[PDB]
Amino acid sequence: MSHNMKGQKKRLAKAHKQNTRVPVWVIVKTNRKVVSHPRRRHWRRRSLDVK
């Protein structure tokens, strides 16, 4: 239970919602030419550069 201030938790919130796949309709609209982005990650890897 690391004790974050408000800005640290806000940054972790943005990092959490960045870590989601591309929507299906974006892949359908782009002719499958946009299938990923660099912000995919897993929590048990390289730690966040957030705090």
């Binding site: 938790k9 806000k10 972790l12 919130a13 959490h16 919602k17």
Partner: protein
């Protein structure tokens, strides 16, 4: 720069409509006093306390406990939550 975004509706948020409470998504920059005053200005119902929390989605959820009975149901009917 309104403090209120919209009422928050989940299975747990609708669990408090019988308790006279109503949970809202508000501006994260706001405080309890601003949420209380803006809700009382927006609907006229008197608020007894504010139970605020900030979620991991980047938002703030506020639970307003009203004083008059059935104010939560009246506000839900006026908004169409129910």
């Amino acid at each position: 720069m309104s403090s209120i975004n919209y009422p928050f509706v989940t299975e747990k948020a609708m669990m408090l409509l019988d308790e006279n409470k109503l949970q809202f998504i508000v501006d994260t920059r706001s405080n309890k006093k601003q949420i209380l005053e803006d809700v009382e200005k927006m609907y006229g119902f008197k608020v007894k306390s504010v139970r605020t929390m900030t979620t991991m989605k980047g938002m703030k959820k506020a639970v307003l406990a009203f004083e008059e009975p059935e104010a939560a149901h009246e506000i839900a009917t006026r908004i169409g939550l129910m």
